[model samples]
Target: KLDKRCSLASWIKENIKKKECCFYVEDGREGICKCGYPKVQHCDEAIKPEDYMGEQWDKHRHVRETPTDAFGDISFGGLGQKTGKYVRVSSDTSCENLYQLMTEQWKLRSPNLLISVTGGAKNFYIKTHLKDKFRRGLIKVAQTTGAWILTGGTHAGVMKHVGMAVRDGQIVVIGVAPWGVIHNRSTLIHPEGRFPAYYSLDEQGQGRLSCLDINHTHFLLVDDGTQGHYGVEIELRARLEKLISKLSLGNRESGVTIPVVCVVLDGGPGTLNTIYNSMLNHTPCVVLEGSGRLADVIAHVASVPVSKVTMALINRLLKRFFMQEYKNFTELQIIEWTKKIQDILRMPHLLTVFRIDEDKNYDVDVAILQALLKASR
Candidate 1:
């Protein structure tokens, strides 16, 4: 039989004959293996987390492993017609390497402006009119200014809004997210790299894991060897943004470093920390009012003097805005939150509030640009 001849030929070539031989073999539907088996039975096994871990495993810190071809174009969305690029990177990856990958390999143009959008990771709603203005304004700014929009890169909260804004646009939206926390991340792996890997959106089975936003044009999955943990990509994302801000906009003659701005929507304590860090970095942040939760709380208290921001006021605001989550906050945590808020208030110039109702004539994009302009003065 053909199977016997194929197997015999392979055995003889490997064990006894030790010579090259070619046999006319019938091709199976999915292709036949060299040893006469179906391709499925002979294909390589999938790579697992154990493969990424090194021999000397430290409980606290993960050692970097040999680099693999985990970078390629991804085909996602309902029809799988949408395409994007992604790369799996170590948490300690050099910004220079990232810059080179983006510019040289990915062939992305250096951004004129960098808009780092940070807000609620959980889903929340806004007034329809406000949502429309926010989405339209964001895309308009990105398209007109040749800007790069950075987000947590998951299909939830403000990142989802950013994704919706980028629907079928030419603007570049790069998602910087943690590798371990991503839902269905295994589908993205390929040792030799996939030209266009298929990514499915499985919402029900997602559980606590966040799914990548299909609307994003590129993704930078930062792996720190930790699973089911958030905030892993925060430091690296901030560093990348800082490095990107140092780059010249267009050419060397312009001598203009890309201006980086942080736009905050509905957010939580984590968002407060983000705003605090942005203030420390001297980056201008535009806070969208009427977006609910931390944004509304911040917008209300930003204009008030620190001395006037009482603990009772903070408690009241927490109850009003946090609603369902207020029961989980301890007294000490409330005090800590209040302290950070007061500290953030000290940097008045760095904060800009865009009240959708009041600033009807000005678009949200204009507010972002104006904040950067005002900060430069």
Candidate 2:
């Protein structure tokens, strides 16, 4: 009943059922909903006590003992029993199935933004004193925009930091990682509170693999258990994009759709590759600049010409992270360099490099806010 240029103001001009409660929010914050009511979210449902299965999970098994660390202190992951709410799939499981599980089981509604952050995993914490601000900014943006944060589903680097930054249920935290990664090391208690249900590719007859128990509202495991980026970054991006596409297509029937935006922090070559691919798929990337390593490098390079991303530049920026001697320069040096250049050419707005510092902590938050505001329309 409307044209493609059907602006919010125009759409609601003749569409309001009631004049008193109708005011469309074209941009920024307001106390209004699409249906023109004083804005709020869902209230808690009254669950029947006798019908509750949460308390009876103890019949499934007993609990664990608290363990002390080298510092001789009691440590815990959290306290809770399995709600049996998550997706565990194998290679045979299609990406569509995984998407359905998210919809059916988690009741994940549309219009939720997914920020996938990847950075220098091992040294992210040690590289900057502005860690608190980075994390705080994420939480601020997450809550303000009603985002659903999706990460690598690991307990290392910026991935873990991003996971921890957002709250449990307010803004959904979904993890999509490959098989084999260290998790559950920080706490002793097994999968408690908002701790993510352990989901992995049920790869039977496959070699032994590692996994982590993320503090997620839901989790999905991609199938590749082998080494390298085979099933990790590629599959994760594919699955996420598929879900985003699914959400976008359903908007006409669902009223609105959730956007899946990516945030790339300091990372190595693999991280850059993921960022590049996301861009190719027309996925907007929020590059967390000044976080160090490739995160900073990409922002710097994107500002300059592709030829400027040369060996001299590479050695100057990357030597500390690699071998001291520049005895051999691998092909990955040129691969990521080429992709970063190609990615920036696609669109000025496609890859937004938010230059963040201790002084400008809200930079990322504001950028995200604007993107979210636009995405909601």
Error of 2 at 88 (Å): 2.5
- Local distance difference test, per candidate? 0.76, 0.49
Tens-place lDDT digits, model 2, residues 324-377: 323455667655565565555455567667765555546467766665444344
RMSD for all candidates, in order, please. 12.3, 19.5
Clashing pairs in 1: none
Tens digits of per-residue lDDT for model 1 on 121-174? 999988888888788788888888889999999999999998887785478899
Of candidate 1, the 10-residue stretch with the lowest lDDT total is 16-25
TM-score computed on alpha carbons, candidate 2? 0.61
lDDT of prediction 1: 0.76
Residue pairs with clashing backbones, model 2 = 111-257, 111-258, 112-258, 119-266, 120-266, 180-210, 181-210, 196-214
Can you tell me which runs of candidate 1 are displaced by over 4 Å? 1-62, 250-255, 305-307, 358-360
Per-residue error at 233 for model 1, in Å? 0.9
Model 2: residues with Cα > 4 Å off, grouped in runs: 1-85, 126-129, 167-169, 180-214, 225-233, 249-257, 304-311, 320-346, 357-363, 370-377
